[PDB]
Every structure is written in structure tokens, then in C-alpha cells.
Design a protein around this ligand. Structure first.
Ligand SMILES: O=C(O)C(=O)CP(=O)(O)O
Ligand SMILES: O=C(O)C(=O)CP(=O)(O)O
Ligand SMILES: [Mg+2]
Ligand SMILES: [Mg+2]
Lengths: 872, 872
């Protein structure tokens, strides 16, 4: 029992039960705002709908109808009544906001007779039939899936016959006619079934459609891109209708109390006089900037601006609002903390702080850590842009430099992107169904629609460039081409877009590295202030190190050493070592590498200036270094005075069934200690030296990969220590160094307390750990991961987001057991997860000392790290 | 009386009397630091030296010698005594720090006999003669002006004979010999006079040389580039010597408690074992990074690091220090708040704030507003730099992208720059004498010398790129060429330098617009927080407006309108107007301009979004718009069906003796009201429109230039109001607008109360005001301004720095009288002065409402504005 709540019965706290929209309608109601009345069917009733074989239980329906009685009475109007009908809107909303992915049905309750009593009661038939044909369309769209196309097609016919230019120029007779044409569609696509004439059937149809939709392939895919758990469900909000299409003193709009693309304080958005939401979003009649409404209706604007600032001070954050003016009276229909780009969240959280509205803690905790990846998106190269051939212009909906090949359907764009092409989605407008392809594109270019069109809002969300409403464009879906300014563009052709200026360019404009907004540096100073995790970087070179330190990296959590062996002037040393038959010949071969590698390391220690650096010993099997090309093998043979066949028999001998789990890492160091001794001499000779040259202290961190047994790490640790002590004696050095291990083999975590007896520190290599915990290679996982996503078996990609429940158990355990034998054991993480907020939060919570990610992701972890401290 | 103070007798407060160095030695002494003892001859004794015909008065000498007795006793050694001599250093220092411009003489007191007693008393003759030959050189340099060259030449001979590689490898016999060769120089350049053998003559000679030097052409020029008043004088510090050349456990160094180029926290600098200051600065023996000393002498380093952090916490700012270790004992010789680049001052003031050391007020007030011009210096274009042909590398002393033509003497570089060439000064090392040319160069490239060499420190000061110590270079002063890496560079050849990486490039590398450091945005938020002046920008286009708003411009204080008449598609309209003979023909001609100008203004109001914008009416005389080329006149005649002679007679008729003070501005609007009516119709039609399109309110600000009489402004104001009211009626607009005036004719300030009866706001055009107050055109002022600088008649350029005493009187008065007739009179400033800190402080103090400067200077005024509030 208790599946439905009146707006008055809830608040912003009951969000999990009401959903964002529901809890926000309740909250605004509580504040006494001109919020039309209604009720919310809870997220729990959604789960219940799912636990009852995808059917509305008897009790929920009783309660829906029961609340509808409550509305009828409040209003003095019978729901869908043939005489003076009560009409309602039905709007779906889950705990997490999903702008552009949810559903809205306006004017529900209308039928062949309720519309006449409606036209009679309002004395405005054009208005009654306008609403009824709007409901027929939205209901067919939302409840079934008749493509808006079939309706727009019908309305376009009628306007392009009655010799009309806008929807606004249609007769009540035309609308009356259109409504019959629209109903013919829903029927002419429903096994002959006719449009539901009963208001209750309409309401239950809309309700089950919302729940049903929660499991649409598009909602699934979307929730994973946004880390929304599927079991959250969605609530359904039912509200008494207010109409912005009753006439000239009526309208509807969508506003942001601050710019969601820049963060700049002030009202932002659009509206339309005489219209319903759909129209604004669709932009057929070009939306007016919200500021112009003060021109049209100063009075409602004054009231709206006050209510908007009251909503921002109250939620203590920028608000995304929706309102409708009905014959001169203002109503608010929604408000939610507005989605925004990274630049925007920083700028805003900083103004909110400076005005006394929120604390620095509230500001840091508020920002979506993941979005900071946007801050480093390459921006355009001024010279290049300047010489760029502007071919058109429009609304800069979402910021960013996009340059890519054009496609005309999300699927074609998503696919092209898979094949490694930068893409540009060009559409009349986008819809929920285009989501994945929108996620695959560099940028989005739309023909119609403004700042609050689907593409605009979904892109601000993704942090993806979008120029929308470029009415100059003429799309040719049939031929996959479009005409703008100077030419006709065919699929594949490059074009660039500047979502900051709204400018469109012919060709592929050059871009360079983004800089960094103050307020970025400010949030970072606030982030560093509360975070306890240190943040290190995965950097293999001097240049990546600087950029990384330049972003707050406090050192290096993973310096791979493979390139020091793979590079052109190196490869032959290891090949010669591989093809030798003597431990002495293996040594001489290896030793030739010392000058080159000691050089790489010096250069890293120079760039580091005392910061630490965890150096990873050789990770791949030997087979990776030998030539695979019969020709390349030929030449290896010629260089080492061997027969091609002899080389071939060596390459064949090094071959493995599963390279991922073969003779490599520590196991390779065990059979061939020479390799580690050599890497150790290169590391220590470089440190000592750079240290005698700068006076800046260094404490090398040597890390052994692919370890699963204490004694296994000890065999290698002993080799390295002997060489490090030797190099120290040759150079009269007191330098300290620490030899630790990677924890990336499940056994290593399970026996970490034993491993900790030898390892002076642990680094969690979570790509491997996850591969071995889950039992699969990332590279082969593609042929099924997707079926897993589609089927809901996984809601997150394990390679990108740390699997807390499983792999997370091994990381917690490793740290705990490791510290039982070595209390001050320092623990870091350097697999891909180290830069993922939730992953960085789990690490903070289980005690890691630091996380480590690629240069450009450092700000994300710094911010993630601070939130983890604050939130825990 | 009281011309000399012991270190113990003063403190950091007595700076004006002691000078920076003097007051700092006193302060460190007060803190009980290992500061060798001494006394300071005050800045007042310098003035006294000047008021006595440039002679040391009898009383000052008595007091100098008197203090020297105090030292002798403290030390138990007689000043210059033949047996156990007391030796002292003499160091000049004024109230304002002038790094690289002051004087230092070490080992003063040595003579032919005191050096033997010195060698005897220390049992180290090599050490005694080393010091004596150092004193001979420095004294000849400093007191006379024998070029270091004549000595380095002599020492190079001797080393390149005794087959030696360093100064350190010279025998006491060699030094004994060298000292005689050095003395021969001072004599062989002094009318046969021999080197002063009397310690007292040496001390008085050094003292008078310091005062004398305060009036050196190079000190003058330097003080103006740095706004140091000449009457401040300089003090002379006399200190008991500590020697870092006594041996292997002796040394000398210069450190910064934080990086003065980046601001990065931590010790920065260099030193040399067995040497005296000179050596470090000169970098013959490449200076060691200060961090390496912990390797050589951990004990003195530990003590030095503690003392350094005690000096920073105490002065509560980054410290520039100088120390000497004498046979294992550490002494500090100087400390001063360190000079630094803009990036560095921000970063630092921000860390100091975050550590609790200084308040945000103390941080803002501390930064040198003028230096922010550095923050917008174009930086290199990554692609360009990447493809750049690195030809050499060295120490990145001072940050910045420099690209220019190379020169080998400051004078050649300064001159070349006058002719508009970007320049690159390449020198073995720089000296005080190269200052102006260093000020003319894009960058500085030196052969020897490190982070604390002359070029390095003076450039950090100027905010100019410098790569120093590139020992690979081979300069050919004689042929004006240098060999580096791949080639031989000849005068004029382009080369670029990256003072951030120390890299040197062949050719002219492309640069783009700088970005902006957080901590910049942070100081700005702190600056805006305390500043009361608003800051507007001098911007004539959409693009300059954005950049300007992008930097904190709160609108526009001057939108010139000339280009709207000069541009290619405009010029003929005004030419036709000029050549018409009818007020009706003048109108029709003018009116053709309205669509083009209304267009420029719309675009400005679009970019402005409600910010204000003071629009300046047509400023130049008519003669400026007519063709001056007989050919161009020919074509004007052909276009207007006139004879070339007729056009010529019009151009001749519009000619003026002095265009600066002719028929223009308001006077032109009086005779030809048409012009202002037209500009008014373009302004108001654009505002109303952009306002009907955005709903964003606009309140046009129309400003009349070159006004000196109430009734004169009223004649024009009446014309504009009639047209503005008319345009408002044609468009049904309630738009408000304000008509004000420029105050740039002295009469206008003198009668400002009358002017204020008509003008709704005043803008101070200080280029004009200053021209008319001083009675000269800036363009012709060059043939004497310099003689004025050189002669001290002016210490500041009046066109760049507001003349407070004179022109400032007219600005104060204008505001005061203006507000007697119109209390809320809004006052701004838009001449060049609006972006000069001191100029912006005077404005704040006399009540302006806002200052207005070019886009890129806005941060300077924002910061200047905040300091003005805080400091007043
Ligand atoms: O995650 C791991 O197991 C790592 O070794 C780090 P990498 O895979 O990026 O080298
Ligand atoms: O300073 C003045 O007098 C001005 O009119 C501003 P400008 O000279 O830069 O136009
Ligand atoms: Mg691994
Ligand atoms: Mg002027």
C-alpha cells in the first residue's frame, strides 16, 4: 500500500521515492509556488510493476484513480468529462535527472466528446482542437512509438495547402480535421485499434508506458553512460494542466538562472507565446530568448524572475526551470539543479561561494568530477580558425571545438566512430533514440531547435560541442547530404563547429591544448584542501610528467619501462639478448641497454625534481620483442649471423597460447634475473647522478609486476637489492630506495600479508586484477560485453569503472592484510580505474594512500579525491 | 648631525633613511642573525652631499671615520692596518630596490702593506692576494669606470700562459703579480695617479662614488622606467668582510625562498665554493644550483635553509638572499623581498595566503600592478615551436616567448627597436650600462652567467624573456656575429628564445594569445572584492569588447567612432559630405552612412549584453577625411563630377596650421549639426533594435569630445536629444540615454560646474587634457622629452603617467565642481593614463567612478583599483 503521493505529501528529501521531478514539484508546492496540483506514482510502484510480470497491480490502479478523484474535487472538474473536462499532464522522472530522455504527455483526458465540452467551456474551439491534436500525437509517440514524423508529415501537408506558414495559422476546422487525421494514424498503425477514448484508459496507458520505457534499450545504454543504476526505477507525475496555447497572452518556456554552457550569472533560456513545451524544444517557430519576455509581458517576467531567484537561493544551486503563462498568469511546472558543462560548474560553484550562498565544501562536493575531462578537450588553434572558411552560423548550445566527418543518423555516426573516425552528427534535430550516436560524435549540428532543444541539452550533458538551429541547412536524408552556404556536403566530408561562437566551418580545423579556467585552479585549491589521497600520474616521459605536475600530479605512480626496450635504438639489444644461448651473452646484450635507459631515467628525475616515481619493471613476455614478420626476422638473422630458420624457431619457441597469462613480469625476471639487475643499474645510476647534479633527494621506487607469491617477489627483490647496493657502493651513495610490488594477480591480494613482508609498497594494477578476477581479457571481451550491457547483466564497464563488489573485495583485503605485516605500507592504484571518480572514492574509503591516472585525468582524481574525503 | 647609523641602531621601518639594504641589514641584525657588523651612511647624507656642491661635508666624513672606529674596536682590528687589517665591503642601496643597478666593492682596506699583514695573519698568501686583486678591480670599476674588460683581459692572459684553466688555479705569486698588473691599469688610466693606498682615502673614494653614481645617466633612465623619484638618494652600507674565497670550505651564494620566475615554493638559486659574489654573478665557473650545497656542506645548508625560512616568515614574503660561508661558518649579507615576474607574484601571494602567512588584502596590495602586462604577452604557438629548429639551450632565467632580430650592443638594439624592429640582445653578459637596450629587447640571450647573473635578474624585473649561460655561443663583437649549433648568426638575423624552457631557435617562431593563470583569477576575485572603482574598456569593436569583458571589463568607457567613417565602404560618404555645398546635400551624404554605422553599433550592443558603453562622437577635423594624394583627389573628383582643382581647393580650404587645436570635435558638430544628428540616429536605432531583439536593456551613453563651454555642449546636446527623441517616437521606445561630455580642454575642468548643468557624465580624455595643460603635442614632444628626462626636468613621461601635480589638479577640480551642480555626476577616464596604476590611484582618490583602459590592461586597473582602495 501507499503507491501514490500528492505533491503536498512530499518534499525534496523523498527523491528516491518521488524521483527528481516529483520531489521537486512537492518542494515547490511546499514553498507555496504557483505549481498546478497533482500527484506522483512512486519509483516503488515501478519496481512493483516489474515484480508483477510488467503489469500494473490492482492496488496501484486503485490508488491512481483514487488520486485522480482528489484532483477532480480540488478542481471542480471531472477527469476527461464530456462537459467541463479536467485534463492532466503525465511526466516520468527518476531519482537521477536524465534531461532529454524522459517522457511528457500533455492534455491527457481529451477525447471525441470531452474536446467539445472543452471548446464549449473555454469558448475557444481552435484552442480545444489544438490541444486534442497535440495529445493524439504525444500519446501515439510516448505510449506506442508512432514516429513524430507521421504527424509532422500530416500537419505539413495541411499547412502547405491551406497556404499557411505556421501552426499558429490553423483554423479550429483545420485542427478538428487534423485531429481526425492524427487519430487515423494511431489506428492505421495499431492493428486497427482506435485511439483510447476513455480518460482512465489513457491515464493507465501512459503510466504503464513510462515504466515499460524504463527498460527501453535506449534508457539502458543511457544509464550506463551516466552510471545510473537500473533498479532505481522511475516515478510518474500527474498534474492538472495549464495551457500556454490558449492564446496571445499565453506561452511556455525553459530557463536556467545562470548560463549552463559558460556558468555566467543571469537568466538563460527561451520561450514561445501561444504554444506548449513541444514547440519550444522543436524550434519550428524560432524560440525567443528568455530575456525578451520582459518586452512581451513585463509583469509575468518580473514575477518569473523573482520566483527563479527564490528557487536558486532555496536549492542553493543554479536552477533549470519550466514555466507556462496561461492568459497572463504564471505557473511553474518543474525546477531541478541544472546540468552544465565543466567550465560552467566551476564558474558557478565559485560565484555561489563568493555571494555567501554555499560553502567551499558544498561547492566541491557539488561538481560532477567526471565532467572535468571536458576542461582539457583540445580547443581550436586561433590561426587555423581565423583562416577557417565559415560556411554558416547558429546557436552555440554546448561549447567545444569539434571537427570530424559528417553522418546523418546516430547509427551511422556511432559505427563510423568505431572504425576510428572523428564524427559530426548533422540532424534536423535529435531524439532519445540518437543518444549513443550523439555520444560517439565530436560535435552535433542541428537544423532546428535552440538552447533548450534535445541536442543542446543532451550535449551540454555529454560535454560535447553543438551548434543548433542552423535553419540555413537543407538536409537530404535520402541522399545523405546537406546544403549550407557555399556547398553540398556528402557523408564523410569534414566540417568543424565551434559550440562557443556557433560558427560552422568547411573542413577540418586544427586544434591545440586547452588552458585552464581560474575557478578551476580555485576548486582545485579547495579540492586539495579537503582531499587526503595524494594524486600521482601514469607518465612514461618528461613531457607527460610536466603536464601532469602542471595539473596537480604530486609525482608518478607508474612509469612503464617497455618503450625503453621497444624503441628503434633499443629493440636489437633485447633481440640479441633473446637469441643468445648464454647467461653471459644475455648479460652483455642487456648491459648494452644501460646507457640508453639510464638516460631515459635521468631525464625523468630531472623533470621530477624530487617527486616520487614508481618504476615498473619489464611487463611483457619475450615474444613481444622478437620480429613477427618473416622479413624482419630475416634481417634479425642477418644481424646476428643466424639462419632465418633459427630465428623462426626461437620466435616459435617463445610463442604462447595466452600471452596475457604466460612467461612475463616477475616470472620472466625469475628465469632471467639479468633483466631486473640491468633495469636496476639503469634506475639507480640515473638517480644517484641526477642527485649528485641537483642535490635534490631521490628515493627510487622499484615495482615488480605480475606477482602472486611472497617468495617469488623475494627472489627478484634480492636480485635488485644486490645490484642497487652495488651501484651505491661504486658511487659512494647513501641513497635510499624502496622495492614494492604490483598487486594485480588475485593470489597477491589473498596473500598480501605474506607479500607485504617483502614488498615495501603495493600498487594496484587494476586492469590486470580486473581481467583475472573476471576471468577475461579486455581485448576479447568486446564480443559479449555489449550483449551483457543490453541485457542488463552488467550496468558498468569493469575496465572503466572499478567493480567494487568483486574486484573491490581483493583491493580492500590486500591493503588490510598487507598492513597486518607492514602497518605503514603505502598503497596506490594505477590501472585505468585510478581516474574514475567512484573508483577513486572506493580507494579513498579502503585506505589507499594515493591514486594515479593519466596526466589529463589528474584534476578528475584530485576533485574525486576531495569529494571522497568530504562525502565520507 | 647624525649621518651614520650602526646596524643595531635601525630597523625595517627606517627604510627611507637607511635604504632597502641598510634597513634590511639592521632588521636581520635585530633578529640576531649571523650578520657581519657595519654601519649605514644615510640617504639624507646623499642629499646633503648634493646640497654641498657634490662634496662630502666635513661632518659626514667625521662620522664615517667615527663609525669605522666603532668597527675597529668591535673587531679588534685596525681598518686597513699594515699588520692585522680590518677589511670592509661598501654597498650602495636606496629606499627602492634596484637589482642589477647598484654598487658593491669587497675587501676595501687592502693596500701594498696591509695585504702582507693579511697574508701573514691568515697564513694564506694566495687568499690575501686574491682579495687584493679583487679589490683593485672592483674599486677601479665602481669608483672610476675602468671597464672590467681591461682586467679580465689581464687575468685571461696570465691564465692562458701559466697554462691554467681557472682563476682558482693561480699561485699566490701569480696573484701577487696580477695585483701589480691591476694597479698598473688604474694608474695607466688615471693621469698617472696610483691606486689609493690609504684605507681612509679608499673608503671616502667609494662613498662619494656611490652618491656621485646616483646621478649617472643610467640610474636616471632606470629610475624613470621604474618610477623611482630621483630625490630619494641612496645610502651606503659599510660592513666588516666575510670571505668565501678563503678556501674549499668557503663559498658565496644568492638564493630565493621561492622561484622568482614561476612562483613555485622552494629554494632557488646558485653558489660557488671558494669565491666572492662577483664570480657567481659572472658565471665563469658555472654556478651550482643552491640545492647542491646540501651535498657539499649539509651542515651550513641546514642552517641556511632554516634562516631562509625564518626570513620569509618574518618579512612575510618571498626573500632574495645573499650569503657567504667562511671556512664552514655561515653569514647572511642581504635579504630583500624578491623581485619576480607577474606569474610568480600571483602564484606566491596565493600560497602565502593559503598557508596563513598573509591576508588576501596583504596579497593584493603586495603585487606590482604594472607587471600584469606580462600575463598577456603572447606565448608561443605549440605547433610552431614544435617545428622550430632548436639550435642551442641554456638557463631559462626569465620566462616568455621572445622572437626578434639580433644585436650585439644595447645601443644598437635600442636604436633598431626605435625603427620598429623586434629585437634580441645577445651579449657575453649584461651590465648596468646595457639597461635601456635591455628594455628595448624582446629577449636577452647571454653567453655566461646563471639564474642570478645581471641579465637574469634585470629581465625578471622587466618581465622580459632571457636565456642565460649558453656557453656554446661564440660572440664576435668585432664582426657582429655569433656561432651556435648549426650556424653563424649575423646582426639582424631572427632567432627566438623560450625563457621558460631555456631553448634557443633559429628564425622567427609564431606566437598567439596568452591564457590566464589561476591565482590570476584568484587575485582578481580578491581585487574586485576590495576595489570600489569600476573598470571599463577602450574598445572600438565586438572582438576587443569580448576579450576585455573576458578580463573583467565591466563595459565600455570609450568606443571611438572614427573608423565608422574612415573604413573603405564609408570614406566616400564623408568625402561627398565634405565636398557638398548644401546643408541638404551634407545631410543626404551623411544619411547614407546610417545603415553601416547602425550596423557597427548593433554588433557592439550584441557583444555588450547590457554593459554600458560610452560612445564618442566624431573627433577629427574634416581635413583628415579628404584625400591628400593628388591621385586619390583625382579619383574623388571623378566620382563626384568635379574638377581635380575643385577638390584641391576644398582640401586646401580644410587645411590647418595646428590640426590638434582646429575645427574638430564639438566645434565641428556646432557648424555641422548634421554629423551628430546622424551619429545619434545610428546609435539609437541600433540600441532600440538590439533591445527589441534581446529584451536586454540598454542605456546609450553619448559623449561629445573637445568641449570647453557649457553653451557649446548645450548646442550639440540639443541636436542629439531632438534626434534621439525622434528615433524613439518612430520606434515606440521608452529607452533611456545619457548625453555627457569629455573633459579634455582645460576650460572644461575650470568651468566644470557649468558644464555639468548639461553633461550627464564626464569622461576625462587625458591624452588631450595633458597635451593642453602642458602645452605640447605628444607627437612633436619627442625632440625634447628625452633631454628633459636626461636632465631630470621630468622623471615620468606625462603621456604614460598622469601628472598629478598639474593635470591632476584639473581632473580633481572638474569632478568637484561638476558634482556641485550634479551630485551624482558619473566620472570616468579614458586617455592612456586609465591603465597606469599610479594614475588609477589618483583617480580613485579624487572620486572618479571608473577608469577605462585597453582590453589587455584591464587586469592592471582592476588590481590597481583594489590597491587604491586598500591603500587609501
Ligand atoms: O592495471 C594494471 O594492471 C597496470 O599494470 C597498469 P597498465 O595496464 O596501464 O600498464
Ligand atoms: O585622452 C583623450 O583625450 C582621449 O580622447 C582618448 P584617445 O586619445 O585614446 O582617443
Ligand atoms: Mg598490469
Ligand atoms: Mg581626446
Amino acid at each position: 500500500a501507499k503507491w501514490v503521493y500528492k505533491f503536498e505529501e512530499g518534499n525534496a528529501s523523498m527523491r528516491n521515492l518521488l524521483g527528481g521531478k516529483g520531489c521537486n514539484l512537492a518542494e515547490m508546492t511546499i514553498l507555496g509556488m504557483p505549481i498546478p496540483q497533482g500527484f506522483t506514482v512512486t519509483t516503488e510502484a515501478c519496481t512493483e510493476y516489474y515484480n508483477s510480470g510488467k503489469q500494473i497491480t490492482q492496488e496501484i490502479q486503485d490508488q491512481i484513480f483514487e488520486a485522480i478523484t482528489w484532483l477532480e474535487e480540488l478542481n471542480g472538474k471531472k477527469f476527461g468529462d464530456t462537459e467541463d473536462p479536467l485534463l492532466v499532464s503525465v511526466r516520468s522522472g527518476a531519482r537521477a535527472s536524465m534531461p532529454g530522455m524522459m517522457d511528457t504527455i500533455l492534455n491527457l483526458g481529451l477525447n471525441d466528446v470531452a474536446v467539445e465540452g472543452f471548446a464549449k467551456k473555454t469558448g475557444n474551439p481552435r484552442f480545444a482542437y489544438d490541444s486534442y491534436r497535440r495529445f493524439i500525437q504525444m500519446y501515439s509517440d510516448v505510449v506506442m512509438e508512432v514516429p513524430k514524423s507521421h504527424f509532422e508529415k500530416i500537419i505539413d501537408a495541411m499547412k502547405e495547402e491551406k497556404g499557411v506558414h505556421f501552426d499558429t495559422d490553423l483554423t479550429a476546422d483545420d485542427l478538428k480535421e487534423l485531429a481526425e487525421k492524427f487519430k487515423a494514424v494511431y489506428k492505421e498503425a495499431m492493428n486497427g485499434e482506435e485511439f483510447p477514448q476513455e480518460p482512465k484508459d489513457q491515464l493507465m496507458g501512459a503510466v504503464k508506458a513510462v515504466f515499460r520505457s524504463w527498460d527501453n534499450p535506449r534508457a539502458i545504454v543511457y544509464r550506463r553512460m551516466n552510471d545510473i543504476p537500473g533498479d532505481w526505477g522511475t516515478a510518474v507525475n500527474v498534474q492538472t494542466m495549464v495551457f500556454g496555447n490558449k492564446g496571445e497572452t499565453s506561452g511556455t518556456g525553459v530557463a536556467f538562472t545562470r548560463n549552463p554552457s559558460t556558468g555566467e550569472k543571469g537568466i538563460y533560456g527561451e520561450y514561445l507565446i501561444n504554444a506548449q513545451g513541444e514547440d519550444v524544444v522543436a524550434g519550428v517557430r524560432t524560440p525567443q530568448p528568455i530575456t525578451q519576455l520582459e518586452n512581451d509581458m513585463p509583469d509575468c517576467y518580473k514575477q518569473f524572475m523573482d520566483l527563479a531567484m527564490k528557487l536558486e537561493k532555496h536549492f542553493r544551486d543554479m536552477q533549470d526551470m519550466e514555466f507556462t503563462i496561461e492568459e497572463g498568469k504564471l505557473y511553474f511546472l518543474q525546477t531541478r539543479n541544472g546540468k552544465r558543462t565543466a567550465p560552467a560548474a566551476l564558474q558557478i560553484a565559485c560565484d555561489l561561494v563568493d555571494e555567501g550562498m554555499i560553502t567551499e565544501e558544498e561547492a566541491v562536493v557539488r561538481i560532477e568530477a567526471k565532467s572535468l575531462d571536458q576542461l582539457l578537450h583540445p580547443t581550436f588553434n586561433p590561426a587555423a580558425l581565423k583562416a577557417g572558411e565559415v560556411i554558416g552560423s547558429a546557436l552555440p548550445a554546448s561549447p567545444g571545438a569539434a571537427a570530424g566527418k559528417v553522418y546523418f543518423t546516430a547509427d551511422e555516426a556511432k559505427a563510423a566512430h568505431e572504425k576510428g573516425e572523428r564524427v559530426i552528427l548533422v540532424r534536423l534535430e535529435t531524439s532519445p533514440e540518437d543518444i549513443e550516436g550523439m555520444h560517439a560524435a565530436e560535435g552535433i549540428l542541428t537544423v532546428r531547435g535552440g538552447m533548450t532543444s534535445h541536442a543542446a541539452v543532451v550535449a551540454r550533458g555529454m560535454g560535447t560541442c553543438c551548434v543548433s538551429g542552423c535553419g540555413e541547412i537543407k538536409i537530404n536524408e535520402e541522399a545523405k547530404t546537406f546544403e549550407l552556404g557555399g556547398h553540398t556536403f556528402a557523408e564523410g566530408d569534414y566540417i568543424s563547429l565551434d559550440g562557443s561562437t556557433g560558427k560552422i566551418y568547411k573542413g577540418d580545423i586544427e586544434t591545440q591544448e586547452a588552458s585552464v579556467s581560474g575557478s578551476f585552479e580555485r576548486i582545485m585549491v579547495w579540492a586539495d584542501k579537503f582531499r587526503t589521497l595524494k594524486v600521482r600520474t601514469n607518465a612514461d616521459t618528461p613531457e607527460d610528467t610536466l603536464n601532469a605536475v602542471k595539473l596537480g600530479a604530486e609525482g608518478i605512480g607508474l612509469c612503464r619501462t617497455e618503450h625503453m626496450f621497444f624503441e628503434a635504438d633499443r629493440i636489437m639489444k633485447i633481440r640479441k639478448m633473446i637469441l643468445s644461448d648464454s647467461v653471459e651473452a644475455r648479460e652483455e646484450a642487456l648491459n648494452e641497454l644501460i646507457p640508453f635507459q639510464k638516460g631515459d631515467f635521468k631525464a625523468m628525475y630531472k623533470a621530477l625534481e624530487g617527486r616520487p616515481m614508481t618504476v615498473r619493471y619489464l611487463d611483457p613476455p619475450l615474444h613481444e620483442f622478437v620480429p613477427h614478420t618473416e622479413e624482419e626476422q630475416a634481417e634479425l638473422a642477418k644481424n646476428m649471423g643466424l639462419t632465418l630458420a633459427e630465428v623462426k624457431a626461437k620466435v616459435d619457441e617463445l610463442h604462447e597460447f595466452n600471452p596475457m597469462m604466460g612467461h612475463r613480469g616477475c616470472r620472466l625476471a625469475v628465469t632471467y634475473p639479468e633483466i631486473a639487475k640491468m633495469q636496476t643499474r639503469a634506475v639507480m645510476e640515473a638517480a644517484i647522478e641526477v642527485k649528485e647534479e641537483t642535490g635534490i633527494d631521490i628515493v627510487p621506487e622499484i615495482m615488480i609486476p605480475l606477482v602472486g607469491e611472497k617468495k617469488e617477489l623475494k627472489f627478484v627483490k634480492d636480485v635488485v637489492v644486490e645490484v642497487a647496493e652495488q651501484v651505491k657502493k661504486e658511487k659512494g651513495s647513501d641513497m635510499q630506495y624502496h622495492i614494492g610490488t604490483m598487486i594485480e594477480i588475485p593470489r597477491a591480494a589473498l596473500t598480501a600479508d605474506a607479500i607485504a613482508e617483502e614488498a615495501e609498497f603495493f600498487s594496484f594494477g587494476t586492469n590486470d586484477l580486473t581481467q583475472m578476477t573476471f576471468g577475461f581479457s579486455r581485448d576479447d571481451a568486446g564480443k559479449f560485453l555489449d550483449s551483457y550491457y543490453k541485457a542488463k547483466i552488467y550496468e558498468s564497464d569493469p575496465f572503466a569503472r572499478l567493480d567494487q563488489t568483486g574486484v573491490g573485495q581483493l583491493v580492500e583485503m590486500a591493503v588490510k592484510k598487507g598492513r597486518q605485516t607492514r602497518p605503514g605500507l603505502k598503497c596506490g592504484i594505477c590501472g585505468e580505474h585510478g581516474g574514475d571518480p567512484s573508483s577513486v572514492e572506493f580507494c579513498h574509503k579502503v585506505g589507499l594512500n594515493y591514486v594515479s591516472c593519466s596526466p589529463f585525468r589528474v584534476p578528475i582524481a584530485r576533485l574525486a579525491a576531495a569529494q571522497a574525503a568530504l562525502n565520507n
